[PDB]
Amino acid sequence: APQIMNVSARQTTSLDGQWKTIVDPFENGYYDYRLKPYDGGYAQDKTYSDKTKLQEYDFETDKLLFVPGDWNTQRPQLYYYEGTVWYRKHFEYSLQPGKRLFLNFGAVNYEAIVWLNGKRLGRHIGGFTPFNFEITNLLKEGTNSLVVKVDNKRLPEAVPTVNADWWNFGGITRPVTLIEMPATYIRDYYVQLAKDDKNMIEGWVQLEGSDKEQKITLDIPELKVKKEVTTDANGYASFLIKSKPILWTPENPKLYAVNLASETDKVSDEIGFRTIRTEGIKILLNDKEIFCRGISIHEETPYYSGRAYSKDHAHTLLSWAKELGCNFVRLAHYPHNEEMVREAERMGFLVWSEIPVYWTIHWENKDTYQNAEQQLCDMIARDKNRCNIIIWSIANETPHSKTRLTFLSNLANKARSLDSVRLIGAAMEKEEVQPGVLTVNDPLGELLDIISFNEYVGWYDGDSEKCDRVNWTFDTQKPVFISELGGGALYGHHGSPKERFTEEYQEDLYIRHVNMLKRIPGLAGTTPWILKDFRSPRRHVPEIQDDFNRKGLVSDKGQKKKAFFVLQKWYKELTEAYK
């Protein structure tokens, strides 16, 4: 049940493919007509072979869905579907006596309940974080039955809550993986530069199993590092290593082969090293002032606009951001699949990583907070060794209230207790305190390392001309980071620059908006909204939006709109200026 670090480097076997499925809007497979749990629900996966008896379902003859994937793009009937879909997989696995076996879900939105061979393994909430179950002693010989009850109903108390500006993609949205482990295994580990220290690698390792006291070697061959330690009675060891690694940058995204070997287990990784801090209004990477030439990205695929999960999806999306001139991507509004973060790391993109504490979260609900903090912990735990991540984001466009501030302050404190190195951010919002004077007056700012916020001057707030007659002031010397900006346009839809949703309007907006950006004191980064048009049930203009947010600089079909080249040109200028 605890998280497993670096699943892809383990002895893995995929369960992906096409699974049997039952769409169950009234949850008949779980509740009887008295609304009570009952024995003989769909978790038993009883093939309906003996028709002298009555049952009301049969996985064996029902329809398939692809796993991994959202269900919404797989059948017209499931486009809007919010509720329960049952998934069922049969598999065999020969597990040598003494070896251990874990079932890992990359993500399931939103609620997953999991059974193996009719026995409940457990339950998960949160649609974008991984979870696993040990099945070592539950695996049978011959056919095993895996049943997953997936529900994506929107809940007021959930994280996210009943309103958000993206599609409610339900299903087993990321790979399902069997992981074989030795009886005592390296479960988790951390290897990164010490805070603000180009010359000191620090880290720790955590074993799980009955043989917790072991010698461990941390091996970084290219650095001629070979450090041996011994774990304590809890299976834990730490280390400090003086070294001079070549530091990762967007221009040279250097990664090192890192090998961990205990007496009973071994795992290899690719890990880069960098320092990150603010100094006044400056963002310093490896002690050098940088500008975050960024773009925002949802976890949604080119062309068919389903939930992204593969290296293919990531490489295409990031290849567009590369052509745009970016050294930075904001992955909104939740943890993305690990392939996306890894491809950003290898290709040279700094990353903003976020949890979906989005809009009107139930700040007074203690279960809601525990959910948000669990997603925070899981986000950091999975990716703590990804040096390209420099900002953890704890919220996006949340309304001001005392309970909200308390909620978010506790998340910010928790984040810092988990990771003293990376910057803490959150998408705040702007105000126009007096005509023409724009600022960010949000008490949340005091808990953040950057003045990060969304603003839509020239789209939601005025026509494009308004960019020309506003200026920005901030009452603190922290780097200013505009985490969203921009406007909508349909690729191939042309007209006057005054006509909204034409490419020409969006282009004119970006020209005047960039001019405004150039006047902002302390500006250190921009991640305009957004790289690719994406699905949203709040975008209803027929033939223009058609259930897509159209603020992409690239269409959902991979076409660069006119405004793409306005931002590209400015990012080219910023690249030269920050050399």
Ligand X SMILES: O=C(O)[C@H]1OC(=O)[C@H](O)[C@@H](O)[C@@H]1O
Which residues contribute to the site for ligand X (CB under 6 A)? Answer: 165, 333, 396-397, 427, 454, 484, 529, 549, 551
Residue 550 engages Cl ion in binding (rule: CB under 5 A): yes
Question: Is the CB of 57 or the CB of 256 nearer to its own copies?
Answer: 57
Query: CA dist 507 to 80, 263, 298, 482, Å?
Result: 33, 60, 22, 19
Closer CB to ligand X, 116 or 372, in the complex: 372
CB of 412 to ligand X, least distance (A): 19
Residue 17 within binding range of its own copies, rule CB under 8 A = yes
Stretch 443-482: interaction string toward Cl ion, x if CB under 5 A? ----------------------------------------
For residue 120, which phi and psi values (nearest 5 degrees)? -70, 125
Can you list the positions of beta strands (E) in 397-488? 423-429, 431-434, 437-439, 451-454, 471-472, 480-484
Amino acid at 5: M
Residue 87 binding: pick among its own copies, ligand X, Cl ion, none (C-beta 5-8 Å cut-off by kind): none
**How far is 402 from 107, CA to CA, in rounded Å?**
32
529 annotated among ligand-binding-site residues = yes
Q: Which secondary-structure segment (H or E) carries 86? A: strand 84-91
- The mark string for 154-193 relative to its own copies (x by CB under 8 A, - otherwise) is x-------xxxx--x-------------------------
Does the protein bind its own copies through residue 83 (CB under 8 A)? yes
297, 532 in Cβ contact below 8 A? yes
Name the residue nearer to its own copies (CB basis): 209 or 558: 558
Residue with structure tokens 């087993």?
Answer: 172
- CA–CA separation, 361 and 348 (whole Å): 34
Is the CB of residue 129 less than 8 Å from the CB of residue 377?
no
Strands of the sheet containing 431-434, edge to edge, are 431-434, 437-439, 471-472
Residue 427 to residues 129, 283, 392, 453, Cα–Cα distance (Å): 21, 17, 11, 4
- 488 near Cl ion, judged by CB under 5 A: yes
In the complex, minimum distance from the CB of residue 360 to ligand X, in angstroms, rounded to a whole number: 13
Which option in ligand X, Cl ion, its own copies, none does residue 552 bind, with CB closer than 5 to 8 A by kind?
Answer: none
Separation between Cα atoms, residue 168 and residue 178, nearest integer Å: 27
Provide the CA 256 distance to its chain's centre, in angstroms: 24
Toward ligand X, which CB reaches closer, 529 or 564?
529
Which of its own copies, Cl ion, ligand X, none lies near 550, with the C-beta cut-off 5 to 8 A by kind?
Cl ion
Out of 254, 277, 315, 414, point to the residue binding its own copies (CB under 8 A): 315
Within positions 458 to 517, which residues make up the interface with its own copies, using CB under 8 A?
Answer: 459-460, 463, 490-495, 498-501
Binding-site residue positions for alpha-D-glucuronate: 165, 358, 396-397, 454, 460, 529, 539, 549, 551
Q: Which residues are annotated as a binding site?
A: 165, 358, 396-397, 454, 460, 529, 539, 549, 551
